[PDB]
Amino acid sequence: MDVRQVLHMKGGAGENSYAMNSFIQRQVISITKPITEAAITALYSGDTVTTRLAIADLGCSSGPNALFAVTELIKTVEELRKKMGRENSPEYQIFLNDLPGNDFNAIFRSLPIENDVDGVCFINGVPGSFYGRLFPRNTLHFIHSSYSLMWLSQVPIGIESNKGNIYMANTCPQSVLNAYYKQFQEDHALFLRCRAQEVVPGGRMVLTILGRRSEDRASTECCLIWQLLAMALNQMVSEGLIEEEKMDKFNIPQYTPSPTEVEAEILKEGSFLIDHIEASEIYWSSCTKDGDGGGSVEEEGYNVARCMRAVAEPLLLDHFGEAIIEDVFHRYKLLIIERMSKEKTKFINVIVSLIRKSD
Amino acid sequence: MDVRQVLHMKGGAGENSYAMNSFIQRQVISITKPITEAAITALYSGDTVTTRLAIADLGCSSGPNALFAVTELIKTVEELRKKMGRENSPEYQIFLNDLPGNDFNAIFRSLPIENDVDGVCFINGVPGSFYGRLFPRNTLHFIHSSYSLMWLSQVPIGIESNKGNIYMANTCPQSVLNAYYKQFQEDHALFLRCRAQEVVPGGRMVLTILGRRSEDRASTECCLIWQLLAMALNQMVSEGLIEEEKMDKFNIPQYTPSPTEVEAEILKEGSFLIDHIEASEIYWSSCTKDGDGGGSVEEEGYNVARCMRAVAEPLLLDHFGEAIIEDVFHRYKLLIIERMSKEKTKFINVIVSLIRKSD
Numbered sequence: 001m002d003v004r005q006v007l008h009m010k011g012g013a014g015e016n017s018y019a020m021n022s023f024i025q026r027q028v029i030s031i032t033k034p035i036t037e038a039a040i041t042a043l044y045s046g047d048t049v050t051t052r053l054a055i056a057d058l059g060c061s062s063g064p065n066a067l068f069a070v071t072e073l074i075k076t077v078e079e080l081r082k083k084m085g086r087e088n089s090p091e092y093q094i095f096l097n098d099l100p101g102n103d104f105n106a107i108f109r110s111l112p113i114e115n116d117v118d119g120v121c122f123i124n125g126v127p128g129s130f131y132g133r134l135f136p137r138n139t140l141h142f143i144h145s146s147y148s149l150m151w152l153s154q155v156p157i158g159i160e161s162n163k164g165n166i167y168m169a170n171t172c173p174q175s176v177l178n179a180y181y182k183q184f185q186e187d188h189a190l191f192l193r194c195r196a197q198e199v200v201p202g203g204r205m206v207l208t209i210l211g212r213r214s215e216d217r218a219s220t221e222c223c224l225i226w227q228l229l230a231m232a233l234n235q236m237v238s239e240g241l242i243e244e245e246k247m248d249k250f251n252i253p254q255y256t257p258s259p260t261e262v263e264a265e266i267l268k269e270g271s272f273l274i275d276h277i278e279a280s281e282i283y284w285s286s287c288t289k290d291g292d293g294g295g296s297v298e299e300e301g302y303n304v305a306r307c308m309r310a311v312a313e314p315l316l317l318d319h320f321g322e323a324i325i326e327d328v329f330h331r332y333k334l335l336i337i338e339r340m341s342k343e344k345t346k347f348i349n350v351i352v353s354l355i356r357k358s359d
Numbered sequence: 360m361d362v363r364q365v366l367h368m369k370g371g372a373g374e375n376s377y378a379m380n381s382f383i384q385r386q387v388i389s390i391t392k393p394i395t396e397a398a399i400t401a402l403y404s405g406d407t408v409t410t411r412l413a414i415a416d417l418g419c420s421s422g423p424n425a426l427f428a429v430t431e432l433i434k435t436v437e438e439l440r441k442k443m444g445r446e447n448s449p450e451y452q453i454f455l456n457d458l459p460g461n462d463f464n465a466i467f468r469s470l471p472i473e474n475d476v477d478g479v480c481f482i483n484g485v486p487g488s489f490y491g492r493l494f495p496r497n498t499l500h501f502i503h504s505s506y507s508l509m510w511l512s513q514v515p516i517g518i519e520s521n522k523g524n525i526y527m528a529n530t531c532p533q534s535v536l537n538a539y540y541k542q543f544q545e546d547h548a549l550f551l552r553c554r555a556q557e558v559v560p561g562g563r564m565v566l567t568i569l570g571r572r573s574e575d576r577a578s579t580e581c582c583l584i585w586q587l588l589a590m591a592l593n594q595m596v597s598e599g600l601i602e603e604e605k606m607d608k609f610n611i612p613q614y615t616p617s618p619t620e621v622e623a624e625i626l627k628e629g630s631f632l633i634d635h636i637e638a639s640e641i642y643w644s645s646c647t648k649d650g651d652g653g654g655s656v657e658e659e660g661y662n663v664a665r666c667m668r669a670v671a672e673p674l675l676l677d678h679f680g681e682a683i684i685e686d687v688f689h690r691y692k693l694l695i696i697e698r699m700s701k702e703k704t705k706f707i708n709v710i711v712s713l714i715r716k717s718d
């Protein structure tokens with residue numbers, strides 16, 4: 001019950017939600033530029049990428065970021081082909097992938113409004129799950145992917161997650177719960193097999209999954225944010241609100257963090273090589289040089305909520321209905337604002353650069 | 360003034376408009392099956408199409424039809440590969456193209472809801488004008504295209520089209536108007552050049568443009584339907600309604616019919632071969648075995664209007680605003696119902712099958 005595929009996407013661009021609330025995932029893509037520079041330099045260096053380069057963003061979204069990274073690759077490549085590696089640029093063939101029901105219209109419109117693109121970039125939207133095959137065999141040289149690979153194929157089955165039902169969140173789950181991990185394995189390995197068939201032997205993949213360091217499936221490194229949402233909900237279930245305890249006891253984000261558990265999966269599948277694989281970290285700055293450069297009634301208050309709202313409003317709205325929503329984010333907002341103080345909130349970013357190997 | 364590219368699309372699927380009003384374009388695709396059978400048999404016969412076949416619909420839309428034809432090719436091909444021509448099927452790679460701002464979400468959703476597809480069909484939406492390049496060089500084996508190629512790049516420039524301003528419509532235009540033809544040439548030839556670069560040397564293209572026989576740029580063969588709309592409008596301009604005469608004197612559909620004028624263009628560009636090229640015709644049946652199998656208060660009344668509404672409501676709504684709309688189609692409706700009687704309304708379908716030649 002609950003088909004992630006048909007159910008989740010991020011709030012649709014234009015308005016205040018996901019486009020107007022994804023600056024943090026934007027900075028992560030920023031900071032991850034170097035790892036990707038090595039990646040495309042390495043791949044461009046010497047032919048495999050001849051007359052056609054085919055970059056593909058997996059789990060892109062709406063608004064900026066969708067094209068942000070696939071636009072700093074075509075950049076770099078062009079800057080090489082001129083400082084020499086070849087005399088002509090290749091034609092860039094882009095593939096923006098996401099689940100059906102993401103805002104492809106929003107991108108095709110308010111975005112490529114940039115008619116064509118430099119070096120000529122043929123853009124293509126590919127709807128579907130990346131936990132399966134999206135492109136023909138040996139079609140791709142380069143696969144980018146930030147903050148999307150932690151999302152799961154489905155919710156993990158066995159679940160007695162009562163209190164902090166929401167997630168793998170720490171304290172009170174009972175290892176029985178961590179069938180999440182058992183889930184991540186079959187999902188992530190099925191992702192790799194597929195990618196292995198479509199990525200050309202020289203091809204590169206730079207995946208950025210939001211995970212952790214603590215090797216302890218339950219830490220504020222990953223479980224807080226949902227815990228905070230859960231906490232917001234459990235108070236409303238108590239206060240009497242349209243969640244019986246029967247309803248909340250069924251909601252559960254379906255995604256999993258982790259760091260070495262990744263390499264653990266990448267080599268099990270003997271398809272990709274590995275490189276610079278690390279785990280960076282970022283603060284819930286969730287802003288920019290924003291007008292008011294506030295404290296918490298801003299920095300997390302609102303900015304970290306509107307983000308977690310554009311990110312989960314649909315999962316919720318679909319499991320509890322609109323009547324709630326307004327209220328759960330007003331509360332959730334406050335909880336993080338306060339939780340912002342007693343501690344320094346942040347996320348971990350297992351990053352991996354890879355190479356289809358074999359031949 | 361009036362960027363077709365940003366401005367027109369057909370009414371967005373789901374509701375009563377284009378999905379629920381395109382049965383006529385559906386029958387044309389039906390009747391055009393044979394020409395396409397020859398086309399893909401010829402192309403499948405003997406390798407060029409090895410492990411990857413790449414069909415691409417140009418000017419697809421929303422709802423059925425988008426996939427309708429690209430789904431009766433993958434069909435046919437499969438039926439050959441088994442009655443032998445090979446032991447395995449290729450992977451099908453589909454490209455659905457339309458202007459930005461068509462309903463790609465509607466297709467990606469309510470349509471591929473059919474998870475994947477038989478023989479595995481990777482679907483890709485390509486937003487952009489086909490009066491330019493949409494895919495890399497030598498990327499395509501097979502290009503389908505019904506009722507979209509008569510649409511122009513833009514409105515033709517010089518225009519003193521006062522009365523039946525709406526179109527190339529007969530009586531009262533003054534050959535000066537038929538700068539439409541001068542338009543069709545630069546548009547259609549620029550379509551061919553582009554297609555010529557992306558269609559692989561063995562590749563086929565089956566284009567179905569709504570045109571005419573009469574070789575006379577102005578006949579009920581093509582100019583009636585708009586004339587009828589124009590007629591509906593001119594009565595409202597008169598009746599005082601929110602069209603000064605200044606407004607109506609600027610609206611003008613930007614597309615052109617024709618039949619031999621097509622081959623005339625295809626060989627001028629020395630890129631494609633030609634084959635079975637004909638011109639079939641179809642009645643404004645605009646229905647199916649519909650409940651009530653009416654007469655005219657139905658057959659054209661409504662059914663031929665709702666179609667011409669899902670087809671032009673946007674061009675209008677954008678040139679005159681919503682205040683009108685309701686009223687212009689109520690009237691337009693009646694005019695065709697009546698015009699249905701004194702005569703037997705129908706359209707002509709210049710159809711062309713082609714082959715990238717050279718090498």
Ligand SMILES: Nc1ncnc2c1ncn2[C@@H]1O[C@H](CSCC[C@H](N)C(=O)O)[C@@H](O)[C@H]1O
Binds near residue numbers: 059
């Ligand atoms: N199985 C799956 N296949 C494809 N996309 C998926 C997916 N599961 C989740 N996603 C997508 O992953 C996207 C993650 S949000 C990504 C934001 C962007 N890449 C950035 O770095 O800012 C969501 O729109 C969601 O629909």
Ligand SMILES: Nc1ncnc2c1ncn2[C@@H]1O[C@H](CSCC[C@H](N)C(=O)O)[C@@H](O)[C@H]1O
Binds near residue numbers: 417420425456
């Ligand atoms: N320059 C252009 N490039 C791509 N698509 C175009 C175009 N000009 C018009 N179109 C598209 O052509 C489509 C024609 S309606 C097509 C219906 C479908 N092919 C059928 O046979 O029923 C419109 O959605 C429109 O946006």
Ligand SMILES: O=C(O)c1ccccc1O
Binds near residue numbers: 225
């Ligand atoms: O999918 C996301 O972008 C996301 C971002 C921050 C925290 C949890 C998440 O699932």
Ligand SMILES: O=C(O)c1ccccc1O
Binds near residue numbers: 506614670
């Ligand atoms: O674009 C169409 O589908 C169309 C259909 C019937 C008459 C005129 C048109 O432009």
Ligand SMILES: [Lu+3]
Binds near residue numbers: 037076
């Ligand atoms: Lu650089």
Ligand SMILES: [Lu+3]
Binds near residue numbers: 396435
């Ligand atoms: Lu057949």
